[PDB]
Amino acid sequence: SNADIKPLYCVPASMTLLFQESGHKKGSFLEGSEVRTIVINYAKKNDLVDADNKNLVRLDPILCDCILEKNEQHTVMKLPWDSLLTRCLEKLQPAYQVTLPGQEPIVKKGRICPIDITLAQRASNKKVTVVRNLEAYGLDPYSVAAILQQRCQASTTVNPAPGAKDSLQVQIQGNQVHHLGWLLLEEYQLPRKHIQGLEKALKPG
Protein backbone atom coordinates (compact mmCIF):
# COMPACT_ATOMS: atom_id res chain seq x y z
CA SER A 1 0.00 0.00 0.00
CA ASN A 2 0.89 3.69 0.13
CA ALA A 3 3.19 4.70 2.99
CA ASP A 4 1.24 5.51 6.14
CA ILE A 5 2.20 8.25 8.60
CA LYS A 6 0.09 8.27 11.75
CA PRO A 7 0.24 10.65 14.73
CA LEU A 8 0.64 9.05 18.17
CA TYR A 9 0.74 10.03 21.83
CA CYS A 10 3.15 8.67 24.44
CA VAL A 11 2.11 8.38 28.12
CA PRO A 12 4.41 10.34 30.47
CA ALA A 13 4.97 9.42 34.13
CA SER A 14 2.76 12.33 35.19
CA MET A 15 -0.33 10.69 33.68
CA THR A 16 0.09 7.05 34.72
CA LEU A 17 -2.60 7.27 37.44
CA LEU A 18 -5.20 8.47 34.92
CA PHE A 19 -4.33 5.66 32.49
CA GLN A 20 -4.17 2.95 35.18
CA GLU A 21 -7.62 1.46 34.52
CA SER A 22 -6.96 1.36 30.76
CA GLY A 23 -3.96 -0.89 31.33
CA HIS A 24 -1.50 1.52 29.72
CA LYS A 25 1.71 2.46 31.55
CA LYS A 26 4.43 5.11 31.12
CA GLY A 27 5.77 4.72 27.61
CA SER A 28 2.64 3.31 26.00
CA PHE A 29 1.81 4.68 22.55
CA LEU A 30 -1.80 5.62 21.77
CA GLU A 31 -3.80 7.06 18.90
CA GLY A 32 -5.89 10.14 19.64
CA SER A 33 -9.13 8.16 19.39
CA GLU A 34 -7.95 5.79 22.12
CA VAL A 35 -7.07 8.68 24.41
CA ARG A 36 -10.56 10.12 24.03
CA THR A 37 -12.15 6.75 24.81
CA ILE A 38 -9.95 6.26 27.87
CA VAL A 39 -10.68 9.72 29.26
CA ILE A 40 -14.44 9.45 28.66
CA ASN A 41 -14.43 6.02 30.33
CA TYR A 42 -12.51 7.47 33.28
CA ALA A 43 -15.00 10.29 33.84
CA LYS A 44 -17.95 7.90 33.66
CA LYS A 45 -16.46 5.14 35.81
CA ASN A 46 -15.51 7.64 38.50
CA ASP A 47 -18.94 9.33 38.40
CA LEU A 48 -17.44 12.71 37.49
CA VAL A 49 -19.98 13.81 34.90
CA ASP A 50 -22.06 16.74 36.19
CA ALA A 51 -25.63 15.73 37.03
CA ASP A 52 -27.10 19.02 35.76
CA ASN A 53 -24.94 19.46 32.66
CA LYS A 54 -23.75 16.35 30.81
CA ASN A 55 -21.23 18.49 28.90
CA LEU A 56 -19.23 19.01 32.11
CA VAL A 57 -16.71 16.89 34.01
CA ARG A 58 -15.98 17.55 37.68
CA LEU A 59 -12.24 17.15 38.22
CA ASP A 60 -11.06 14.63 40.83
CA PRO A 61 -7.55 14.94 42.36
CA ILE A 62 -6.06 12.71 39.63
CA LEU A 63 -7.35 14.98 36.87
CA CYS A 64 -6.45 18.09 38.88
CA ASP A 65 -2.86 16.88 39.25
CA CYS A 66 -2.05 15.96 35.66
CA ILE A 67 -4.01 18.27 33.34
CA LEU A 68 -4.48 21.46 35.36
CA GLU A 69 -1.92 24.27 35.43
CA LYS A 70 -0.52 25.56 38.71
CA ASN A 71 -2.62 28.74 38.65
CA GLU A 72 -5.76 26.63 38.12
CA GLN A 73 -5.12 23.98 40.78
CA HIS A 74 -7.60 25.30 43.36
CA THR A 75 -9.84 27.34 41.07
CA VAL A 76 -11.10 25.31 38.10
CA MET A 77 -13.51 22.66 39.40
CA LYS A 78 -15.13 21.51 36.15
CA LEU A 79 -14.19 21.35 32.48
CA PRO A 80 -16.28 20.72 29.39
CA TRP A 81 -15.35 17.67 27.31
CA ASP A 82 -13.72 19.78 24.61
CA SER A 83 -11.27 21.41 27.03
CA LEU A 84 -10.67 18.26 29.08
CA LEU A 85 -9.81 16.20 26.00
CA THR A 86 -7.63 18.87 24.38
CA ARG A 87 -5.71 19.31 27.63
CA CYS A 88 -5.20 15.55 27.98
CA LEU A 89 -3.81 15.28 24.44
CA GLU A 90 -1.45 18.23 24.94
CA LYS A 91 -0.03 16.74 28.14
CA LEU A 92 0.92 13.51 26.38
CA GLN A 93 4.24 13.18 24.58
CA PRO A 94 4.11 13.78 20.79
CA ALA A 95 5.03 10.80 18.64
CA TYR A 96 4.27 9.21 15.29
CA GLN A 97 4.32 6.00 13.30
CA VAL A 98 5.69 5.45 9.79
CA THR A 99 4.69 2.37 7.80
CA LEU A 100 6.63 1.98 4.56
CA PRO A 101 5.14 -0.37 1.92
CA GLY A 102 5.56 -4.00 2.96
CA GLN A 103 7.25 -3.14 6.27
CA GLU A 104 6.31 -3.18 9.95
CA PRO A 105 5.52 0.22 11.46
CA ILE A 106 8.37 2.23 12.97
CA VAL A 107 7.55 4.35 16.00
CA LYS A 108 9.17 7.76 16.53
CA LYS A 109 9.12 10.27 19.40
CA GLY A 110 8.54 13.92 18.52
CA ARG A 111 6.84 15.61 15.57
CA ILE A 112 7.25 14.57 11.93
CA CYS A 113 9.11 16.86 9.53
CA PRO A 114 9.37 16.48 5.77
CA ILE A 115 12.30 14.94 3.96
CA ASP A 116 14.27 17.94 2.74
CA ILE A 117 15.99 18.11 -0.66
CA THR A 118 18.32 20.95 -1.63
CA LEU A 119 20.77 21.84 -4.37
CA ALA A 120 24.26 23.01 -3.43
CA GLN A 121 26.27 24.87 -6.06
CA ARG A 122 29.94 23.93 -6.06
CA ALA A 123 32.99 24.43 -8.29
CA SER A 124 32.08 25.71 -11.75
CA ASN A 125 28.42 24.94 -12.53
CA LYS A 126 28.73 21.64 -10.67
CA LYS A 127 25.72 21.00 -8.46
CA VAL A 128 25.26 18.51 -5.64
CA THR A 129 21.90 17.13 -4.51
CA VAL A 130 21.51 16.97 -0.71
CA VAL A 131 18.88 14.88 1.06
CA ARG A 132 18.07 15.33 4.75
CA ASN A 133 15.81 13.82 7.45
CA LEU A 134 15.61 10.34 5.90
CA GLU A 135 15.90 8.74 9.33
CA ALA A 136 12.70 10.46 10.50
CA TYR A 137 10.96 8.04 8.09
CA GLY A 138 12.91 4.94 9.15
CA LEU A 139 15.03 5.09 5.99
CA ASP A 140 18.66 4.05 6.14
CA PRO A 141 20.79 6.78 4.48
CA TYR A 142 23.45 4.27 3.38
CA SER A 143 20.80 2.17 1.63
CA VAL A 144 19.23 5.23 0.02
CA ALA A 145 22.68 6.38 -1.14
CA ALA A 146 23.43 3.00 -2.71
CA ILE A 147 20.07 2.86 -4.49
CA LEU A 148 20.52 6.36 -5.89
CA GLN A 149 24.03 5.53 -7.11
CA GLN A 150 22.42 2.88 -9.31
CA ARG A 151 19.46 5.04 -10.34
CA CYS A 152 21.38 8.26 -11.04
CA GLN A 153 24.54 6.59 -12.35
CA ALA A 154 26.32 9.21 -10.25
CA SER A 155 28.57 9.17 -7.18
CA THR A 156 26.83 9.24 -3.78
CA THR A 157 28.14 9.81 -0.27
CA VAL A 158 26.73 9.89 3.23
CA ASN A 159 27.92 12.82 5.37
CA PRO A 160 27.07 14.49 8.69
CA ALA A 161 24.07 16.82 8.53
CA PRO A 162 23.65 20.08 10.50
CA GLY A 163 21.71 20.02 13.77
CA ALA A 164 21.38 17.02 16.09
CA LYS A 165 24.31 14.68 16.69
CA ASP A 166 24.92 11.81 14.25
CA SER A 167 22.33 13.25 11.84
CA LEU A 168 23.11 12.19 8.28
CA GLN A 169 22.56 13.54 4.79
CA VAL A 170 22.90 11.82 1.43
CA GLN A 171 24.85 13.71 -1.23
CA ILE A 172 24.61 12.91 -4.92
CA GLN A 173 26.82 14.49 -7.58
CA GLY A 174 24.80 16.54 -10.07
CA ASN A 175 21.18 17.70 -10.16
CA GLN A 176 19.17 14.61 -9.21
CA VAL A 177 16.03 16.03 -7.59
CA HIS A 178 13.82 14.26 -10.12
CA HIS A 179 15.30 10.88 -9.12
CA LEU A 180 14.45 11.59 -5.48
CA GLY A 181 10.92 12.10 -6.76
CA TRP A 182 11.00 8.60 -8.20
CA LEU A 183 12.56 7.03 -5.10
CA LEU A 184 10.35 8.66 -2.49
CA LEU A 185 7.04 9.06 -4.37
CA GLU A 186 7.09 5.90 -6.49
CA GLU A 187 9.31 3.31 -4.80
CA TYR A 188 8.43 4.17 -1.19
CA GLN A 189 5.02 5.62 -2.04
CA LEU A 190 5.40 8.48 0.44
CA PRO A 191 2.64 11.12 0.42
CA ARG A 192 3.81 14.23 -1.46
CA LYS A 193 3.31 16.52 1.56
CA HIS A 194 6.17 14.74 3.40
CA ILE A 195 8.78 15.90 0.88
CA GLN A 196 10.21 19.39 0.54
CA GLY A 197 12.29 20.54 -2.44
CA LEU A 198 10.81 18.59 -5.35
CA GLU A 199 9.77 21.96 -6.79
CA LYS A 200 13.48 22.33 -7.59
CA ALA A 201 13.47 19.42 -10.06
CA LEU A 202 14.72 19.95 -13.62
CA LYS A 203 11.84 17.93 -15.05
CA PRO A 204 8.64 16.25 -13.79
CA GLY A 205 10.10 12.85 -14.68
Swiss-Prot record:
GO cellular component: cytoplasm; cytosol; nuclear body
Alphabetically ordered keywords of this record: Acetylation, Cytoplasm, Initiation factor, Phosphoprotein, Protein biosynthesis
Record-annotated SWIB/MDM2 domain positions: 7-91
Molecular function GO labels: RNA binding; signaling receptor activity; translation initiation factor activity
Keyword Iron: no
Compartments where located: Cytoplasm
Domain of life, per lineage: Eukaryota
Record GO biological process: formation of translation preinitiation complex; intracellular protein transport; IRES-dependent viral translational initiation; ribosome disassembly
Domain SUI1: start-end pairs: 115-188
Family stated for the protein in its record: Belongs to the eIF2D family.
Role this protein plays: Translation initiation factor that is able to deliver tRNA to the P-site of the eukaryotic ribosome in a GTP-independent manner. The binding of Met-tRNA(I) occurs after the AUG codon finds its position in the P-site of 40S ribosomes, the situation that takes place during initiation complex formation on some specific RNAs. Its activity in tRNA binding with 40S subunits does not require the presence of the aminoacyl moiety. Possesses the unique ability to deliver non-Met (elongator) tRNAs into the P-site of the 40S subunit.
The protein's name: Eukaryotic translation initiation factor 2D
Annotated source species: Homo sapiens (Human)
Gene responsible for this protein: EIF2D
